[PDB]
């Protein structure tokens, strides 16, 4: 995951990666604050703000990134200059990292348990009864016919 900063004053680009705890990965500054040319079928012109929309792809010195988000100020400045956003995309979940820290949150105890009780319900409905009547048919059997139950 990376941050891309565009400086309009000189039309330059700075890319970095945010610091994540327990990364087991190098971080800090990625590519510095300079100009970037296209991949070569042609190189004399350089990138210009007129091609930046969400949910598109870019490459910079063979490093391919995909845009998925922006900022309120970015939306302000784009609806100030003119490009039309497509509906914003979706960012996925890094598998190794997510598995390891879900294991490390599995290692976050609470000492749980469950048990039972009877007294409060018992007393709440102590000494009450419903009364209801019913009938069983018996003439199926060739000896008995009927009898009544409560």
């Amino acid at each position: 995951y990376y941050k891309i900063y565009f400086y309009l004053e000189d039309d330059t680009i700075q890319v970095n990666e945010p610091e994540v705890i327990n990364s087991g990965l190098p971080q800090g500054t990625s590519i510095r604050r300079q100009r970037i040319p296209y991949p070569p079928p042609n190189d004399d012109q350089f990138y210009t703000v007129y091609d930046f929309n969400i949910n598109i792809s870019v490459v910079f010195y063979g490093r391919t990134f995909k845009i998925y988000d922006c900022d309120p100020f970015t939306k302000n400045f784009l609806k100030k200059i003119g490009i039309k956003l497509n509906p914003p995309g979706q960012c996925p979940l890094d598998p190794y990292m997510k598995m390891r820290r879900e294991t490390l949150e599995f290692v976050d105890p609470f000492r749980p348990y469950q048990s039972f009780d009877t007294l409060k319900r018992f007393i709440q409905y102590d000494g009450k009864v419903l009364r209801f009547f019913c009938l069983w048919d018996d003439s199926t059997s060739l000896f008995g016919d009927r009898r009544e139950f409560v």
Partner: peptide, 10 residues
């Protein structure tokens, strides 16, 4: 070599 500086006995 583990190089993460935030380890566990795990």
């Amino acid at each position: 070599t583990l190089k993460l500086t935030t380890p566990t006995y795990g």
